[PDB]
Short mmCIF file of N, CA and C in Angstrom, two decimals:
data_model
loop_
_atom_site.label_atom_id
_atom_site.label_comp_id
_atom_site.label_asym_id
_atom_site.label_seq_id
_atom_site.Cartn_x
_atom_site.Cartn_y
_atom_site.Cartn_z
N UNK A 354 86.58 129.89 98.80
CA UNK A 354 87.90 129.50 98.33
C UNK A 354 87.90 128.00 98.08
N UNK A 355 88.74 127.19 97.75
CA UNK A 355 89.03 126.13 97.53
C UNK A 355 90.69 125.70 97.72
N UNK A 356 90.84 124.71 98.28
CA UNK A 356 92.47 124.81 98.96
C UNK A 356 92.97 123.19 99.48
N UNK A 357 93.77 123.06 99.88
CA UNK A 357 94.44 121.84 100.39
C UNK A 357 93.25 120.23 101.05
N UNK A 358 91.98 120.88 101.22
CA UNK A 358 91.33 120.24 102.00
C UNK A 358 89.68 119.81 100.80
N UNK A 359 89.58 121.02 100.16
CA UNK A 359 88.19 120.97 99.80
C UNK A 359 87.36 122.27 99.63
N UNK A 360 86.34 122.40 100.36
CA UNK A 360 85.61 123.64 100.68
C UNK A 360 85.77 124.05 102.06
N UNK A 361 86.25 125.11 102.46
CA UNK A 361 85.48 125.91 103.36
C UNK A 361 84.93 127.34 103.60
N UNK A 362 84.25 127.51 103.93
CA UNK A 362 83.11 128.53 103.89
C UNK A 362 82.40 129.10 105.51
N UNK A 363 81.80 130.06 105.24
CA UNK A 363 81.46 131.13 106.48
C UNK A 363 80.01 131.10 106.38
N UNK A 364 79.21 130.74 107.09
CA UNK A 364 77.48 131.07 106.96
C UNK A 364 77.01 132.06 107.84
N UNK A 365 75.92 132.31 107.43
CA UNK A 365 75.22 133.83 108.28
C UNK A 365 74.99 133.24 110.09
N UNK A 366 75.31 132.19 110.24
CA UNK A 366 74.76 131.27 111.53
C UNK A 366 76.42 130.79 112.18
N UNK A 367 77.40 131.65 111.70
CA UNK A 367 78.51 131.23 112.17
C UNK A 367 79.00 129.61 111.75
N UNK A 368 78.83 129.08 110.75
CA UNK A 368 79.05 127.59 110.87
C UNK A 368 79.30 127.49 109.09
N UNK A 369 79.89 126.10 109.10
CA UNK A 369 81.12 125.31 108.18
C UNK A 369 80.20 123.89 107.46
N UNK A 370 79.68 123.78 106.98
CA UNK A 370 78.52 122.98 106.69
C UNK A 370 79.10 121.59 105.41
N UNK A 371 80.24 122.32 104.96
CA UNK A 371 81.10 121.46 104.32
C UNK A 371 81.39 120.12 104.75
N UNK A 372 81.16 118.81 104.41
CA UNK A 372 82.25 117.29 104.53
C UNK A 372 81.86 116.62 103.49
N UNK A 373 82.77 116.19 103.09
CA UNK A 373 82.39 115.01 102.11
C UNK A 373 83.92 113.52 102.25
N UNK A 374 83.12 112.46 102.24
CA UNK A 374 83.95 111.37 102.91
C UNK A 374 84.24 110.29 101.97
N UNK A 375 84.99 109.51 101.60
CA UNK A 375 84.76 108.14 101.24
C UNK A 375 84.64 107.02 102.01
N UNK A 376 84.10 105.98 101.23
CA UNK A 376 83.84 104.60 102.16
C UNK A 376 84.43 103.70 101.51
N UNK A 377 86.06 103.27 102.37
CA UNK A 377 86.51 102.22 101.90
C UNK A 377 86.26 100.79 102.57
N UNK A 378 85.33 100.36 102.41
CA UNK A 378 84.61 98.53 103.11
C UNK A 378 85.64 97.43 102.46
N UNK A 379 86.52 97.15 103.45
CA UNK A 379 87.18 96.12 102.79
C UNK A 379 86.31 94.29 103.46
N UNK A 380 85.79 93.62 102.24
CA UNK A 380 85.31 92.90 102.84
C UNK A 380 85.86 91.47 103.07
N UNK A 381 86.28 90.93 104.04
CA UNK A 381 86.13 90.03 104.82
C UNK A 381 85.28 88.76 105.17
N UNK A 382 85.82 87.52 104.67
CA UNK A 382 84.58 86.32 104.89
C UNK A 382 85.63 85.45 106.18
N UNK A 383 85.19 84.26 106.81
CA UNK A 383 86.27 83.18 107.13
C UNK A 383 87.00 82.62 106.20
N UNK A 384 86.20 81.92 105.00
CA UNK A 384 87.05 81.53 104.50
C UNK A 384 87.46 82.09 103.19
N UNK A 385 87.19 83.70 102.68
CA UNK A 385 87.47 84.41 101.00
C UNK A 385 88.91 84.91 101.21
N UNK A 386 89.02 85.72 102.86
CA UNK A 386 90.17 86.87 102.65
C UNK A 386 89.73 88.25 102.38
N UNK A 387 90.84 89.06 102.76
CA UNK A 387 90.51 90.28 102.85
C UNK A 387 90.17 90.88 101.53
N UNK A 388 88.62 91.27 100.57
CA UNK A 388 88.92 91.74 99.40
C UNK A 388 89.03 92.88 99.74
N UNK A 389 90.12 94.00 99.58
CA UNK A 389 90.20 95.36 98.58
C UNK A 389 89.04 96.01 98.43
N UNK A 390 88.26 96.74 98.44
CA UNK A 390 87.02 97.18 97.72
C UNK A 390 86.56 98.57 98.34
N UNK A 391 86.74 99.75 97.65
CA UNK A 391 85.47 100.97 98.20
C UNK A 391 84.16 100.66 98.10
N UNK A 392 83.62 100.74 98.78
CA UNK A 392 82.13 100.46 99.01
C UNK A 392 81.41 101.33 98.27
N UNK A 393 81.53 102.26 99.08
CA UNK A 393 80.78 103.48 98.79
C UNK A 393 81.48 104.89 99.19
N UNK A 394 80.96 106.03 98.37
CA UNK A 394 81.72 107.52 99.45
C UNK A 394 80.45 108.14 99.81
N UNK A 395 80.98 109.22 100.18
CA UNK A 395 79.69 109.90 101.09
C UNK A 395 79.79 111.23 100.67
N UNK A 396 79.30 112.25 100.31
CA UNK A 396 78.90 113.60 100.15
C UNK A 396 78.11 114.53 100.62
N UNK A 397 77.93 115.96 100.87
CA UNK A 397 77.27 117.03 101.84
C UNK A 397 76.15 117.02 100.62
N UNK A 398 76.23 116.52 99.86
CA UNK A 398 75.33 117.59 98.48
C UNK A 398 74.21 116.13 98.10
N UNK A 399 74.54 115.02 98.10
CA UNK A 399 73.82 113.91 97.90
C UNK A 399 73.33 112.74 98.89
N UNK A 400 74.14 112.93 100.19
CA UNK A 400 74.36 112.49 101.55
C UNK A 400 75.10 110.64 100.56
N UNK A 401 74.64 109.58 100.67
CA UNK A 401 74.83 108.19 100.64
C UNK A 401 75.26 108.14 98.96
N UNK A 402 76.35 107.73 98.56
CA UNK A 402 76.63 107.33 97.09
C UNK A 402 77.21 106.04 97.26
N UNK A 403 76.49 104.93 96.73
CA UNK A 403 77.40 103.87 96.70
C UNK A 403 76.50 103.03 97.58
N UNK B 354 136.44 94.02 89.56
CA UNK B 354 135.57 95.48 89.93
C UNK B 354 134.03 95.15 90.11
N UNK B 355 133.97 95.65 90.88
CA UNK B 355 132.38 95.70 91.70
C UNK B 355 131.54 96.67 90.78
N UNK B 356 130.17 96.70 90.73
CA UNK B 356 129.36 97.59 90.26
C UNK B 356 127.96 96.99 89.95
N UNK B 357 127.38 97.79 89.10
CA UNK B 357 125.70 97.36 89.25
C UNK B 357 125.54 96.10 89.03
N UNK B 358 125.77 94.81 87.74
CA UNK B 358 125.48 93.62 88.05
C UNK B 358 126.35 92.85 89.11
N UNK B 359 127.26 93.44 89.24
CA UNK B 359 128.40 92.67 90.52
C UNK B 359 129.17 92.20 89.85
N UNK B 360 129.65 90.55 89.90
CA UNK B 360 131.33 90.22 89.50
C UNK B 360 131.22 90.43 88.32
N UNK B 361 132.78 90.52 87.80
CA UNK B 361 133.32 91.29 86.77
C UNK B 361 134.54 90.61 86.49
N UNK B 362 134.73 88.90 86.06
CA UNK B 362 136.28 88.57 86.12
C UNK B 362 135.88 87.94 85.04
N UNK B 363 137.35 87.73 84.26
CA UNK B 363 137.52 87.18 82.79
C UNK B 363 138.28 85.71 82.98
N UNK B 364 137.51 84.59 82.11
CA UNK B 364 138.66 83.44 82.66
C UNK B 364 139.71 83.15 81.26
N UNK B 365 140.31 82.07 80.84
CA UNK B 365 140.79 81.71 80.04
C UNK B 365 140.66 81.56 78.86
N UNK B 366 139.09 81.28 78.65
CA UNK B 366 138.41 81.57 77.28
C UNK B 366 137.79 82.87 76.96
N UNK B 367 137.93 83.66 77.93
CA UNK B 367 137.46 85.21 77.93
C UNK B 367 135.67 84.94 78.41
N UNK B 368 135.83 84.61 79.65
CA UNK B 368 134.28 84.36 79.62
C UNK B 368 133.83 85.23 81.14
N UNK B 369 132.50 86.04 81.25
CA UNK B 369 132.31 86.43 82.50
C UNK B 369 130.49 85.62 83.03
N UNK B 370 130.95 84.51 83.90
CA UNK B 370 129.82 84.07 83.98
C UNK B 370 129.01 84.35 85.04
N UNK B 371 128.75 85.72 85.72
CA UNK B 371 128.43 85.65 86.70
C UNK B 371 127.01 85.88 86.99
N UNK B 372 126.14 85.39 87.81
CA UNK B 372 124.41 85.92 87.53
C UNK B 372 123.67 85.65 88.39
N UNK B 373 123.23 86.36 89.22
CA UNK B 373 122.24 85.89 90.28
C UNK B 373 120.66 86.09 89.91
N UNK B 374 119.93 84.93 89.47
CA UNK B 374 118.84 84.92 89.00
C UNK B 374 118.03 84.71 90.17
N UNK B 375 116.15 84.81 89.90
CA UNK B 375 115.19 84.19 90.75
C UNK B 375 114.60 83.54 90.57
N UNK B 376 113.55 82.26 90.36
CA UNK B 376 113.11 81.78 89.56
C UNK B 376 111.58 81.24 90.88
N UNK B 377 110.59 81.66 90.65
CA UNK B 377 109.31 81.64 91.74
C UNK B 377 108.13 81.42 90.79
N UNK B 378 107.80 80.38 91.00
CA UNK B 378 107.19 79.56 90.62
C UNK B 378 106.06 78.98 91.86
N UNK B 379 104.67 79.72 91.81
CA UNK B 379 104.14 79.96 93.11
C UNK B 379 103.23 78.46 92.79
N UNK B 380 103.03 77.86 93.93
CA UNK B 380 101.86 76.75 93.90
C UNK B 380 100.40 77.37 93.70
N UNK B 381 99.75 76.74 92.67
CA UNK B 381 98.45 77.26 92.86
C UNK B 381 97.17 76.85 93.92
N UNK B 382 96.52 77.59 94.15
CA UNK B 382 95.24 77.24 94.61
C UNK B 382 94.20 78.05 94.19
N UNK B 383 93.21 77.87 93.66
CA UNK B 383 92.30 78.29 93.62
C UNK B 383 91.18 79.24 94.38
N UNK B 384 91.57 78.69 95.26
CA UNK B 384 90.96 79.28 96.65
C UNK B 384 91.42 80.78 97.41
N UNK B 385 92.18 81.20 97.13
CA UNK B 385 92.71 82.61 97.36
C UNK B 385 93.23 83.48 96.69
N UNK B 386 93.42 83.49 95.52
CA UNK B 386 93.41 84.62 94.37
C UNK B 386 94.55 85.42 93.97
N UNK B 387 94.35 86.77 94.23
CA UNK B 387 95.83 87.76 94.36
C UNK B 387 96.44 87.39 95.32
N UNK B 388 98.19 87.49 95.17
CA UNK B 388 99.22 87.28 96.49
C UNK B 388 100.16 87.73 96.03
N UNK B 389 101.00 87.89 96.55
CA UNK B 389 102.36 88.32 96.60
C UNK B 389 103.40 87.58 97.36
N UNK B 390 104.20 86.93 96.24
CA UNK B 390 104.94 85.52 97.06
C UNK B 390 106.21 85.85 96.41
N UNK B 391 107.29 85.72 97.12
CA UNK B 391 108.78 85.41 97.02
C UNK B 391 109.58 84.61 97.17
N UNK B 392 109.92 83.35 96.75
CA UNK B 392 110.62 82.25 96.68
C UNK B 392 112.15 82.71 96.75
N UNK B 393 112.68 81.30 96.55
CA UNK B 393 114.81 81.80 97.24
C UNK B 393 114.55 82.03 95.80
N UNK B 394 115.94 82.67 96.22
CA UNK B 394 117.19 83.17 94.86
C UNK B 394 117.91 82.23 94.33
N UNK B 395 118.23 82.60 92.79
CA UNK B 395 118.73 81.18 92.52
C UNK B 395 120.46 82.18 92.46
N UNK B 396 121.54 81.74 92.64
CA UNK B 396 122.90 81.83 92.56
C UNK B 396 123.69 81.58 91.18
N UNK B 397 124.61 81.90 90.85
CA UNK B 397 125.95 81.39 89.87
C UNK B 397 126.65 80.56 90.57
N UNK B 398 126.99 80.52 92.29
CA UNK B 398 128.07 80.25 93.00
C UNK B 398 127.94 78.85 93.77
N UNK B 399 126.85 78.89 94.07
CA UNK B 399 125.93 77.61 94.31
C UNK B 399 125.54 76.42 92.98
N UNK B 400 125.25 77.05 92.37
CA UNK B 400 124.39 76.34 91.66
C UNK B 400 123.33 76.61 91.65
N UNK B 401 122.62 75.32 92.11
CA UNK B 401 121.19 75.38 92.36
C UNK B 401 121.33 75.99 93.90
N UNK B 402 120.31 76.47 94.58
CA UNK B 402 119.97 77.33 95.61
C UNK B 402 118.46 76.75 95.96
N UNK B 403 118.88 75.50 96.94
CA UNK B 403 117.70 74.82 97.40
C UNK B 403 116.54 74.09 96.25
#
């Protein structure tokens, strides 16, 4: 199915193998300020993007 | 009568001068970028407003 969240799913091993995340890095110097910025996201299917 | 811009009176020459403006005019620096700044309000009733 597909629904409010994403994927979830049933495996022959009892288990949910589904996550996929984003990475919002807001970066921070002493003296720049807080920039704004997604870094990177994260995925079950590619693991590291970004 | 009261309502969305506010006063509402007529004088002798038929005039309604009423207006509450803002006028923000931020100091620059170079050094910190995007902001979000709010200076006073300027008045009809006052005059100038600081």
């Amino acid at each position: 199915i597909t629904g409010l969240t994403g994927v979830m799913e049933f495996r022959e091993d009892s288990s949910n193998p589904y996550v996929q995340f984003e990475i919002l890095g807001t970066t921070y110097s002493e003296t720049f300020g807080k920039d704004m910025r997604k870094l990177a996201t994260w995925d079950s299917e590619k693991g590291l993007n970004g």
